[PDB]
Each structure stands twice: as C-alpha cells, then as structure tokens.
Coordinates of C-alpha atoms and ligand atoms in Angstrom, one line a residue:
Chain A
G1 CA 2.6 -12.0 -32.1
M2 CA 2.1 -9.0 -29.2
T3 CA 2.1 -10.4 -25.8
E4 CA 2.6 -8.5 -22.0
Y5 CA 5.1 -10.0 -19.9
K6 CA 4.9 -9.0 -15.8
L7 CA 8.3 -9.3 -14.4
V8 CA 9.7 -8.4 -11.1
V9 CA 12.9 -7.8 -9.9
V10 CA 13.8 -9.3 -6.7
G11 CA 16.8 -9.3 -4.3
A12 CA 18.0 -8.0 -1.3
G13 CA 19.2 -4.4 -0.9
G14 CA 21.7 -3.0 -3.6
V15 CA 22.4 -5.9 -5.0
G16 CA 21.7 -3.7 -8.4
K17 CA 18.2 -4.1 -9.4
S18 CA 17.4 -0.9 -10.1
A19 CA 20.6 0.4 -12.2
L20 CA 20.4 -2.9 -13.7
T21 CA 16.9 -2.7 -15.1
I22 CA 17.6 1.0 -16.0
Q23 CA 20.9 -0.6 -17.9
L24 CA 17.7 -2.4 -20.1
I25 CA 14.9 0.4 -20.4
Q26 CA 18.0 3.3 -21.2
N27 CA 21.4 1.8 -21.8
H28 CA 22.8 3.8 -19.3
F29 CA 24.7 2.9 -15.5
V30 CA 23.3 4.5 -12.6
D31 CA 25.5 4.7 -9.8
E32 CA 23.4 6.6 -7.2
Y33 CA 19.0 5.8 -7.5
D34 CA 17.2 6.3 -4.6
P35 CA 17.7 2.7 -2.3
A36 CA 13.8 2.5 -1.4
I37 CA 12.0 4.1 -4.5
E38 CA 9.6 0.7 -6.2
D39 CA 8.1 1.5 -9.2
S40 CA 7.5 -0.2 -12.8
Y41 CA 9.0 0.0 -16.3
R42 CA 8.1 -0.5 -19.7
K43 CA 9.7 -1.5 -22.5
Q44 CA 9.1 -3.2 -26.2
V45 CA 11.1 -5.3 -27.2
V46 CA 11.5 -8.4 -30.0
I47 CA 12.7 -11.7 -28.2
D48 CA 12.3 -15.3 -30.0
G49 CA 10.8 -13.3 -33.5
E50 CA 7.8 -12.3 -31.1
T51 CA 7.3 -8.1 -30.4
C52 CA 7.1 -9.0 -26.7
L53 CA 5.7 -5.9 -24.3
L54 CA 7.4 -6.2 -20.9
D55 CA 5.8 -4.8 -17.2
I56 CA 8.9 -4.6 -15.0
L57 CA 8.8 -3.8 -11.3
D58 CA 12.5 -2.7 -9.6
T59 CA 11.1 -3.5 -5.8
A60 CA 12.0 -2.1 -2.7
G61 CA 11.0 -1.7 0.6
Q62 CA 11.7 -4.4 3.8
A63 CA 8.1 -3.8 5.1
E64 CA 4.6 -5.2 4.2
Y65 CA 3.9 -4.7 0.5
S66 CA 2.4 -2.0 -1.7
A67 CA -0.5 -2.3 -3.3
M68 CA 1.0 -2.0 -6.3
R69 CA 3.6 -4.4 -5.3
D70 CA 1.5 -6.9 -3.5
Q71 CA -0.2 -7.7 -7.0
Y72 CA 2.8 -7.7 -8.9
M73 CA 3.9 -10.3 -6.8
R74 CA 0.5 -12.3 -7.3
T75 CA 0.1 -11.3 -10.8
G76 CA 4.3 -11.3 -11.8
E77 CA 4.8 -14.0 -14.5
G78 CA 8.3 -14.4 -13.6
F79 CA 11.1 -13.3 -11.4
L80 CA 14.5 -12.2 -11.4
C81 CA 16.4 -13.9 -8.0
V82 CA 19.4 -11.2 -8.2
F83 CA 22.3 -10.9 -5.9
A84 CA 25.8 -9.5 -5.6
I85 CA 28.5 -11.9 -6.2
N86 CA 30.8 -9.6 -3.5
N87 CA 28.4 -9.8 -0.8
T88 CA 27.9 -13.1 0.5
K89 CA 24.7 -12.4 2.7
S90 CA 22.9 -11.3 -0.9
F91 CA 23.3 -15.0 -2.3
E92 CA 22.2 -16.2 1.2
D93 CA 19.1 -14.5 1.3
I94 CA 18.0 -15.9 -2.4
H95 CA 16.5 -19.2 -0.9
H96 CA 14.0 -17.0 1.2
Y97 CA 13.5 -15.0 -1.6
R98 CA 12.5 -18.5 -3.5
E99 CA 10.0 -19.6 -1.1
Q100 CA 8.1 -16.1 -0.9
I101 CA 7.5 -16.6 -4.7
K102 CA 6.5 -20.4 -4.5
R103 CA 4.0 -19.1 -1.3
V104 CA 2.6 -16.1 -3.0
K105 CA 1.4 -18.0 -5.9
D106 CA 0.8 -21.6 -4.5
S107 CA 3.2 -23.4 -7.2
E108 CA 6.0 -25.0 -7.2
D109 CA 6.9 -24.5 -11.3
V110 CA 7.0 -20.4 -11.0
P111 CA 9.5 -18.7 -14.0
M112 CA 12.4 -17.9 -12.2
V113 CA 16.0 -16.8 -13.3
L114 CA 18.8 -16.7 -10.6
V115 CA 21.1 -13.9 -11.4
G116 CA 24.7 -13.2 -10.2
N117 CA 24.9 -9.4 -10.8
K118 CA 28.2 -6.7 -10.3
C119 CA 30.4 -9.4 -12.2
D120 CA 32.5 -6.8 -13.3
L121 CA 33.8 -6.2 -9.6
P122 CA 37.2 -8.2 -9.2
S123 CA 36.3 -9.0 -5.3
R124 CA 34.0 -12.0 -6.0
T125 CA 33.6 -13.4 -2.7
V126 CA 30.1 -15.9 -3.9
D127 CA 31.9 -18.2 -6.3
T128 CA 30.6 -19.0 -9.6
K129 CA 30.0 -22.8 -8.7
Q130 CA 27.7 -22.4 -5.9
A131 CA 25.0 -20.0 -8.3
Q132 CA 25.4 -22.8 -10.7
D133 CA 24.7 -25.6 -8.5
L134 CA 22.2 -24.3 -6.6
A135 CA 19.9 -23.0 -9.8
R136 CA 20.5 -26.3 -11.7
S137 CA 19.0 -27.8 -7.9
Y138 CA 15.8 -24.8 -8.8
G139 CA 15.6 -26.1 -11.6
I140 CA 16.6 -22.7 -12.8
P141 CA 18.9 -20.7 -15.3
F142 CA 22.0 -19.0 -13.6
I143 CA 23.5 -15.6 -15.7
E144 CA 26.3 -13.8 -14.3
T145 CA 25.5 -9.6 -15.0
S146 CA 27.1 -6.2 -14.6
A147 CA 25.5 -3.2 -14.8
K148 CA 27.9 -1.3 -15.4
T149 CA 29.4 -2.6 -18.5
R150 CA 25.9 -4.3 -19.4
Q151 CA 27.3 -7.8 -19.8
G152 CA 24.4 -10.5 -19.8
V153 CA 22.1 -7.6 -18.5
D154 CA 19.6 -8.7 -22.1
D155 CA 20.7 -12.3 -21.9
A156 CA 18.9 -13.1 -17.9
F157 CA 16.2 -10.4 -19.1
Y158 CA 15.1 -12.2 -22.0
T159 CA 15.8 -15.3 -20.5
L160 CA 13.0 -15.1 -17.5
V161 CA 10.9 -14.0 -20.2
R162 CA 11.8 -17.7 -22.7
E163 CA 11.7 -19.3 -19.0
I164 CA 7.7 -17.9 -18.8
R165 CA 7.3 -18.9 -22.5
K166 CA 8.2 -22.7 -21.8
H167 CA 6.3 -22.7 -18.6
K168 CA 2.9 -21.7 -20.3
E169 CA 3.8 -24.4 -23.4
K170 CA 3.4 -27.2 -20.6
Chain B
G1 CA -7.4 10.3 30.9
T2 CA -4.3 12.9 30.8
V3 CA -4.2 14.4 28.2
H4 CA -1.7 13.5 25.2
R5 CA -1.6 10.5 26.5
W6 CA -1.1 7.0 25.0
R7 CA -3.2 4.6 26.5
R8 CA -3.2 0.3 26.1
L9 CA -6.9 -0.3 25.0
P10 CA -8.0 -3.8 25.3
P11 CA -6.9 -5.5 22.4
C12 CA -9.7 -7.0 20.0
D13 CA -8.8 -11.1 20.7
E14 CA -8.9 -14.1 18.3
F15 CA -11.7 -15.3 19.7
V16 CA -13.9 -12.2 18.2
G17 CA -11.5 -11.4 15.4
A18 CA -8.0 -12.5 14.0
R19 CA -5.7 -9.7 14.2
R20 CA -5.2 -7.8 10.9
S21 CA -4.2 -5.0 8.5
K22 CA -5.9 -3.0 5.8
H23 CA -8.4 -3.2 7.2
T24 CA -10.5 0.1 7.5
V25 CA -11.9 1.5 10.9
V26 CA -15.3 3.7 11.3
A27 CA -16.2 5.8 14.1
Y28 CA -20.1 6.0 15.0
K29 CA -21.5 6.7 18.4
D30 CA -18.8 5.6 20.9
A31 CA -18.3 2.5 18.7
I32 CA -15.6 1.6 16.7
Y33 CA -16.1 -0.5 13.2
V34 CA -13.4 -2.8 11.9
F35 CA -14.5 -4.3 8.6
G36 CA -12.3 -6.3 6.5
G37 CA -8.6 -7.1 5.9
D38 CA -5.7 -9.5 6.1
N39 CA -4.8 -11.8 8.5
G40 CA -2.4 -13.4 7.0
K41 CA -4.0 -16.8 5.5
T42 CA -7.1 -14.7 4.0
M43 CA -8.8 -12.2 3.0
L44 CA -11.5 -11.1 5.4
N45 CA -15.1 -10.0 5.7
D46 CA -16.4 -9.9 9.3
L47 CA -17.7 -6.6 11.3
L48 CA -16.4 -5.3 14.4
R49 CA -17.5 -3.7 17.1
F50 CA -15.6 -2.2 19.8
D51 CA -17.4 0.3 22.5
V52 CA -15.1 2.8 23.7
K53 CA -17.4 2.6 27.4
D54 CA -16.9 -0.9 28.3
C55 CA -13.9 -1.2 26.1
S56 CA -15.4 -4.3 25.2
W57 CA -15.0 -6.1 21.8
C58 CA -17.2 -8.3 19.9
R59 CA -18.7 -9.6 16.4
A60 CA -21.2 -7.4 14.9
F61 CA -25.2 -8.7 14.3
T62 CA -25.4 -8.6 10.7
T63 CA -28.0 -9.7 8.2
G64 CA -27.6 -9.1 4.7
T65 CA -25.1 -10.3 2.5
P66 CA -21.9 -8.7 2.8
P67 CA -19.7 -7.8 0.7
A68 CA -16.9 -10.0 -0.7
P69 CA -13.8 -10.4 1.4
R70 CA -10.8 -8.0 1.1
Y71 CA -8.9 -5.5 1.8
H72 CA -7.3 -1.9 0.7
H73 CA -10.5 -1.0 1.1
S74 CA -12.3 2.5 2.1
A75 CA -15.0 2.4 4.7
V76 CA -16.7 5.6 5.3
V77 CA -19.7 7.6 7.3
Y78 CA -23.3 9.1 6.0
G79 CA -25.8 9.4 8.8
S80 CA -26.7 6.3 10.3
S81 CA -24.7 4.0 7.5
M82 CA -21.5 2.5 6.7
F83 CA -20.2 3.3 3.0
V84 CA -17.7 0.6 1.7
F85 CA -15.8 1.0 -2.2
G86 CA -13.6 -0.9 -3.7
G87 CA -11.1 -3.1 -2.2
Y88 CA -8.8 -6.5 -3.7
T89 CA -11.1 -9.8 -3.7
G90 CA -10.0 -13.1 -4.7
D91 CA -8.5 -16.2 -1.9
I92 CA -4.5 -15.7 -1.4
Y93 CA -3.7 -19.0 -0.1
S94 CA -4.3 -20.7 -3.9
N95 CA -3.7 -17.3 -5.5
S96 CA -6.6 -17.1 -8.2
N97 CA -9.6 -15.1 -8.6
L98 CA -7.7 -11.9 -7.8
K99 CA -9.1 -8.6 -8.9
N100 CA -9.9 -5.2 -8.1
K101 CA -13.3 -4.1 -7.1
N102 CA -15.4 -1.2 -7.5
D103 CA -18.7 -2.0 -6.0
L104 CA -20.3 -0.1 -3.4
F105 CA -22.0 -2.2 -0.1
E106 CA -24.2 -0.3 2.9
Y107 CA -24.2 -1.1 6.2
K108 CA -27.1 0.2 8.1
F109 CA -26.2 0.8 11.9
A110 CA -30.0 0.5 13.4
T111 CA -30.5 -2.5 11.9
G112 CA -27.4 -4.6 11.0
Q113 CA -28.5 -4.5 6.9
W114 CA -25.7 -5.3 4.0
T115 CA -26.9 -3.4 1.0
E116 CA -25.0 -3.5 -1.9
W117 CA -25.6 -0.5 -4.4
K118 CA -25.8 -1.8 -7.8
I119 CA -25.2 1.5 -9.7
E120 CA -25.7 1.9 -13.6
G121 CA -24.1 4.2 -16.3
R122 CA -19.9 4.4 -16.3
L123 CA -18.2 3.7 -12.9
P124 CA -14.3 4.3 -11.5
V125 CA -12.2 1.6 -12.4
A126 CA -11.4 -1.2 -10.6
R127 CA -9.7 0.3 -7.2
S128 CA -7.4 -0.8 -4.3
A129 CA -5.2 1.4 -2.1
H130 CA -7.5 4.4 -2.9
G131 CA -8.2 7.5 -0.7
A132 CA -12.1 7.6 0.8
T133 CA -14.3 10.6 2.4
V134 CA -17.2 11.9 2.6
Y135 CA -18.3 15.7 2.0
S136 CA -21.5 17.4 0.9
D137 CA -23.2 14.4 0.9
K138 CA -21.2 12.6 -1.8
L139 CA -18.5 10.2 -1.4
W140 CA -15.5 11.6 -2.9
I141 CA -12.9 8.6 -3.8
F142 CA -9.3 9.4 -5.0
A143 CA -5.7 7.4 -7.0
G144 CA -5.6 4.3 -6.0
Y145 CA -4.4 1.2 -7.7
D146 CA -5.9 -0.2 -10.6
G147 CA -4.5 -3.2 -11.2
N148 CA -2.5 -2.0 -14.4
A149 CA -1.1 1.5 -12.9
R150 CA -1.3 3.9 -10.2
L151 CA -4.1 6.5 -9.7
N152 CA -4.9 9.9 -9.6
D153 CA -8.1 10.6 -10.6
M154 CA -11.0 11.3 -8.7
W155 CA -15.4 10.4 -8.1
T156 CA -18.1 11.4 -6.6
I157 CA -21.2 9.7 -5.7
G158 CA -24.3 11.0 -4.3
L159 CA -25.3 9.1 -1.0
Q160 CA -28.6 10.2 -0.5
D161 CA -31.0 8.1 -2.8
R162 CA -29.7 5.2 -4.5
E163 CA -32.5 4.6 -7.2
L164 CA -31.3 8.4 -8.6
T165 CA -27.7 8.5 -8.2
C166 CA -24.5 7.7 -10.6
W167 CA -21.1 7.7 -10.5
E168 CA -19.6 11.0 -11.8
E169 CA -16.0 12.1 -12.8
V170 CA -14.1 14.9 -11.3
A171 CA -12.7 17.3 -13.8
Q172 CA -9.9 17.9 -11.0
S173 CA -7.5 21.1 -11.8
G174 CA -4.5 22.4 -9.5
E175 CA -1.4 20.5 -9.1
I176 CA -2.6 17.2 -8.3
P177 CA -0.6 15.2 -6.4
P178 CA 1.5 12.3 -9.0
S179 CA -0.2 8.9 -8.5
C180 CA -0.4 7.6 -5.0
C181 CA -1.8 4.6 -3.0
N182 CA -2.1 2.9 0.3
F183 CA -2.2 6.8 1.6
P184 CA -4.4 8.7 4.5
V185 CA -6.5 11.5 3.9
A186 CA -8.5 13.9 5.7
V187 CA -10.8 16.8 6.1
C188 CA -10.8 20.0 7.5
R189 CA -12.3 23.3 7.0
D190 CA -13.7 23.0 3.8
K191 CA -10.1 21.6 2.0
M192 CA -9.0 17.6 1.9
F193 CA -5.7 16.8 2.5
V194 CA -3.3 14.7 1.7
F195 CA -0.1 13.1 2.9
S196 CA 2.7 11.7 1.0
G197 CA 1.9 8.0 0.0
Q198 CA 3.1 5.2 -2.4
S199 CA 3.7 7.0 -5.6
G200 CA 6.6 5.1 -6.8
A201 CA 9.1 7.2 -8.5
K202 CA 7.8 10.5 -7.1
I203 CA 7.5 9.4 -3.5
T204 CA 8.5 12.5 -0.6
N205 CA 6.7 14.4 2.0
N206 CA 4.7 16.5 0.5
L207 CA 1.2 17.8 1.6
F208 CA -1.7 18.5 -0.4
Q209 CA -4.9 19.9 0.1
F210 CA -7.7 20.3 -1.9
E211 CA -10.4 23.2 -2.3
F212 CA -13.6 21.2 -2.5
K213 CA -15.5 24.2 -3.6
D214 CA -13.7 24.9 -6.9
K215 CA -11.7 21.4 -7.3
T216 CA -8.4 23.2 -7.0
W217 CA -5.4 20.8 -6.0
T218 CA -2.3 22.6 -4.0
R219 CA 0.8 21.9 -2.7
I220 CA 1.1 23.0 0.7
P221 CA 4.3 25.9 0.3
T222 CA 6.3 23.9 3.5
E223 CA 9.6 24.5 2.6
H224 CA 8.7 27.4 5.1
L225 CA 10.4 25.2 7.8
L226 CA 13.8 26.4 6.2
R227 CA 12.8 29.8 8.4
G228 CA 12.3 28.2 11.8
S229 CA 9.5 25.5 11.8
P230 CA 10.2 22.0 12.2
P231 CA 10.5 19.7 8.8
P232 CA 7.7 17.5 8.0
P233 CA 7.4 13.9 8.8
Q234 CA 9.5 11.8 6.9
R235 CA 7.9 9.9 3.8
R236 CA 6.3 7.2 4.2
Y237 CA 2.8 5.1 3.1
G238 CA 0.3 3.1 5.2
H239 CA 0.1 5.5 7.6
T240 CA -3.6 7.1 9.1
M241 CA -4.1 10.6 9.2
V242 CA -7.3 12.2 11.1
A243 CA -8.3 15.7 12.1
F244 CA -9.4 17.6 15.3
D245 CA -10.2 20.7 16.0
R246 CA -7.9 22.0 12.8
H247 CA -5.1 20.1 13.1
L248 CA -3.8 17.0 10.6
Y249 CA -2.9 13.9 12.9
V250 CA -0.2 11.8 11.0
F251 CA 0.3 8.2 12.6
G252 CA 2.6 5.1 11.4
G253 CA 3.1 3.7 7.9
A254 CA 6.3 2.4 6.9
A255 CA 9.0 4.9 6.0
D256 CA 11.6 3.6 3.5
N257 CA 13.3 1.4 5.9
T258 CA 11.7 2.3 9.4
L259 CA 8.5 2.2 11.1
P260 CA 8.3 5.2 12.8
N261 CA 6.1 6.0 15.2
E262 CA 6.3 9.3 15.9
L263 CA 3.1 11.4 16.6
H264 CA 3.2 14.2 13.8
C265 CA 0.4 17.4 14.0
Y266 CA -0.4 19.9 11.0
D267 CA -1.3 23.1 12.1
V268 CA -3.1 23.9 9.5
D269 CA -4.0 27.5 9.3
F270 CA -0.5 28.3 10.8
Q271 CA 1.0 26.0 8.2
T272 CA 3.2 24.3 10.6
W273 CA 4.2 20.4 11.5
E274 CA 5.3 19.2 15.2
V275 CA 6.0 16.3 17.0
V276 CA 3.7 15.9 19.6
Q277 CA 5.1 15.2 23.3
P278 CA 3.2 12.2 25.1
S279 CA 2.6 12.0 28.5
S280 CA 5.0 9.9 31.6
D281 CA 2.7 7.3 31.5
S282 CA 1.7 6.9 28.2
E283 CA 1.4 3.4 26.4
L284 CA 3.5 3.6 23.5
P285 CA 2.4 1.8 20.2
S286 CA 4.9 0.0 18.0
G287 CA 5.5 1.1 14.7
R288 CA 3.0 -0.2 12.4
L289 CA 1.4 0.5 8.9
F290 CA -1.9 -0.2 7.2
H291 CA -3.5 -0.1 10.4
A292 CA -6.9 2.0 10.2
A293 CA -7.4 5.5 12.7
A294 CA -10.9 7.0 14.0
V295 CA -11.7 9.8 15.9
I296 CA -14.4 9.8 19.0
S297 CA -14.9 12.8 21.1
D298 CA -11.3 14.1 21.4
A299 CA -9.2 11.5 21.1
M300 CA -7.6 9.8 18.5
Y301 CA -8.3 5.5 18.5
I302 CA -5.5 3.1 16.1
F303 CA -6.4 -0.4 15.9
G304 CA -4.5 -3.3 13.6
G305 CA -1.5 -3.3 11.5
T306 CA 1.9 -5.2 10.5
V307 CA 4.0 -4.3 13.6
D308 CA 7.4 -5.1 12.8
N309 CA 8.4 -9.1 10.7
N310 CA 5.1 -9.6 9.5
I311 CA 3.4 -9.9 13.1
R312 CA -0.1 -8.7 12.3
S313 CA -1.6 -6.9 15.1
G314 CA -4.9 -6.5 16.9
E315 CA -3.7 -4.3 19.6
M316 CA -5.8 -0.8 20.5
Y317 CA -4.4 2.3 21.2
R318 CA -5.8 5.3 22.5
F319 CA -4.2 8.7 22.3
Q320 CA -6.3 11.1 24.3
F321 CA -5.8 14.8 22.6
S322 CA -6.2 17.6 24.6
Ligands
GDP401 N1 30.7 -2.7 -10.2 C1 29.6 -2.4 -9.8 N2 28.2 -1.8 -8.9 C2 26.7 -2.1 -9.1 C3 26.5 -2.9 -9.9 N3 25.3 -2.9 -10.6 C4 24.8 -1.7 -9.2 N4 25.8 -1.1 -8.7 C5 26.2 -0.1 -7.4 O1 25.5 -1.0 -6.1 C6 24.7 0.0 -5.7 C7 23.0 -0.7 -5.6 O2 22.7 -0.7 -6.8 P1 21.5 -0.3 -7.0 O3 20.4 -0.7 -8.4 O4 20.8 0.9 -6.7 O5 21.0 -1.6 -5.6 P2 19.5 -2.2 -5.4 O6 18.6 -0.9 -6.4 O7 18.6 -1.8 -4.4 O8 18.9 -3.8 -5.8 C8 25.3 1.3 -6.2 O9 25.9 1.6 -5.8 C9 25.5 0.4 -7.6 O10 26.5 1.8 -8.4 C10 27.5 -3.9 -11.6 O11 27.1 -4.4 -12.0 N5 28.5 -3.0 -11.1
MG402 MG1 16.5 0.1 -6.2

C-alpha cells in the first residue's frame, strides 16, 4: 500500500522539534539549527507492512501562521506534541498546544502523540509519571525520546502514524 | 500633515466591517478598497471603501455575485476595475471544504459589478499567499503556496478582453527567488521587486528584482552594506512593500520572534537601505503582520493586520511621504 500522512511537530521553542525531525530523516543529530526556520520534510518508509509517505512539518515562529503552516495545521493528519524533560515550561504549554489543535480541526479525536524529548539529559525536571498521567487523560500515547541518541525517535513518529490509522478505522 | 509623519486615521468600526487580517487593500481615485480576510472566526468576502477626504468608512455597494469568502488572496487595479485572484476558501469554524483557488474576479468601481472571468485553457495551480501586480496590460502572479509545496512559477493574463484572453506561464530566467509565500510585491521603473518572505529553509533578507522586458531575475548585491551602507531590514514574512518616487518602502511583518515597526526605505537607484525617521508628533503604528498597503497621492496607507497576541486590527494609519 502507498498512503500519504501529513504530520505536524508542535511544541515550545528549543524542545527538540527540528533536531528530532532531522534525526528521523538523516540519522544524525544537529546541535544548532536556526530556531525560527519552518519547512517541510519528506520520507518514504514502511510502517505496519505498508509503504508510508511522510509529509512532516517542523514548526517554528510565534506570530500568525504562514500560509503553509495555516494549511498544514488544518490538513495535518496527526500531531507530535513535544516538550523537553529538562524544561517545565515546555510541559506546561502542552495543554495549550492541544487546545490549539482541537479548535483548529473542530474535533476531540485528533491523532496526537505526547513526546518528552531530551531524555538523555541527566537534569530531568518533568517526571515521567506526570507526562504519563497527562497522556492517559488525553487518551494518547506518551513516548520519551532523545534526538541526541536517537532513542525512541522512530517509535514516537511511527506511533503517530499508527494513531492516524486507528482513528481512520472507527 | 507634516513630512514623514504617521497619522492615526479613524479605524473601521465593527459596525461597518470586522477587524481582519490577510485581506487586500486597493487604491482607486481617493479611496481605499478593502476586500476579504479573516476576522478570527470565519473568512470574509465583504468590500469596504475608505474615503481619504472625509475619512469615512463604508460598506461598498455591490451587485453581482462576489467571490467566495477567502484570505491570502491578491487584488490589483486595471483601469476602472479591481481584479481578485486566488486565495484560500472554505469554512474555518468547522474546518471543512477547504481549498486553494485560482479563479479571477473583476470589480468595476463605476457600477459595483462583480464578474467572474471564467478562463479556458490551462490554468495556474490554485494557490494562496502569492504575489501579484499589473504590468503592460497584463496581470502578473508569482510564487505562493498551492497546498503541496511553496511555488516559484510565474503566470500572466491579459486584462483587456475577457473573451480573447487566456493564461500563459512565464519562462523565467536568472536567479529566481526560492519558493516563497506571504511576501509583498512592488513595481518600480520597469522592474518588479520582491523582498524576503516565507521561503522556509531558505528564508533570508534578500532583495530580488524582475526585469519585465527580458524575464530575468536578479539578486541585488546589497552586501555593499559592509562598505558604509546601513544593513537591510531583518528577514520577515507577511509584510507590506510599496513603491513611491523610485524608493521601496517596507513596513511591518513578523520577523522571527519580533514584530518590528521600523519603516525601511530602499533607494532603488543608489541600491542602498535606510530607516525612515518619523516626525516628533507621529502617532506610531504598533508592530503588525498580514496587513495591506496602498498609496494615494504622496502618502502610504496601512490598514488591518494582526497586532501581537492574536488581536486582529481594524486600525488605519497614514504615513506622509515627502
Ligand atoms: N541533550 C539533548 N539535546 C537536544 C536534544 N534535541 C535537541 N537538543 C538541543 O536543544 C536545542 C534546541 O533544539 P531544536 O531542535 O533546534 O529546538 P526546536 O527546533 O525549536 O524544537 C539545540 O541546542 C539542540 O542541540 C536531545 O535529544 N538531547
Ligand atoms: Mg526548530
């Protein structure tokens, strides 16, 4: 099977969004990538025994949406809500970013995956239990990732694709 | 009244039209014509008319079926009529029936006549956030977002006879700007100019000029700034650029994490930049993006936009050129 999937990586600035999307595609960590640069990425990979076409938007910017983002946010089939496990503020903003997606698409069942990045850092501030509790209440998976070591990077993204498939089943 | 002065003109009351962004502004005679946009809940297709003389806002009189409510569309002038092209159409509140457009509408200022130009033959890809302008009796459209990727093609359409005209795609040569959207376009001398704009991975503060006569793009080597000249304005998107007396005036937009409100002036002949100094008694407009601009006589008019947080604006500002 050949199916396309529009994914949107959301989250506060500097949580890992860029370096995390770059890792899935080029299998290499990038220390410094322009914090306000927003463009799409594409990858053809097999998920659940089907060749998937991934259209991923690494998001940035704080003002009104560029026409490309405006449409990615309305057409996006699934969303990665990313926060840094060493930054409380990125975890607090997740509840806002969720309400954003819910109001944009006018639905309560929107495919989402909660991602706690930077788990390689020994300076953890957001307990794993907290985000696990939050994700269970939202009814979405929670995957801790490290773009530096690539741990869970493939899982978190592929899990979002699985959640899009599950929502399309109902 | 003073030279280089920001005057705060009476904003458009919600009694006439909702505060909006992503709209179009058009100058004709001594009036500003505002069309389309987003009020925060839904897309709009009303037509507003601001008379510069009495500073009177007004819901303009129309007859025919207007274009579908939309934003990120273009609007240009040709004689006694306005021309709207493209945009984003659907229902925001329910997030349904959303699509980009490539239709072409005419608005005769004399009669208020809305008339769709149903063009046959091959059409440009339906797009939004593109740039558009008029030159040599033809409507020029450039770049934009089509729903799949950012664009960099260019098309023309004759604006003389609806029955005989059809779309042609321009064979561009030269250093074409990278795929862009949410940028302003301005024509000066015999050249079309494009400054910055959301080009994703390749976003910079480069100034491109397009020579109409030989279809040639050129990146302005404004790196001469290192030899005394002031640096060009910081890279941005959703800003407005107007031309007046061989000078490009760039205002507004969202620049990374900021919403600067410096008024930048590009001396097109000297190929230098400058930050214009407003008067001591100027009512400075707050930083904004997705506003639209026009020029009447020797003044620039700024209407609308999003002004920090997500507060949409109906404010009208007038900068008096020399
Ligand atoms: N230790 C660690 N640092 C990371 C990780 N991912 C990103 N970073 C760092 O976090 C900073 C911001 O990352 P970036 O992807 O550019 O942030 P964003 O694009 O705004 O989400 C950069 O300095 C990265 O080097 C990670 O998994 N582990
Ligand atoms: Mg980034």
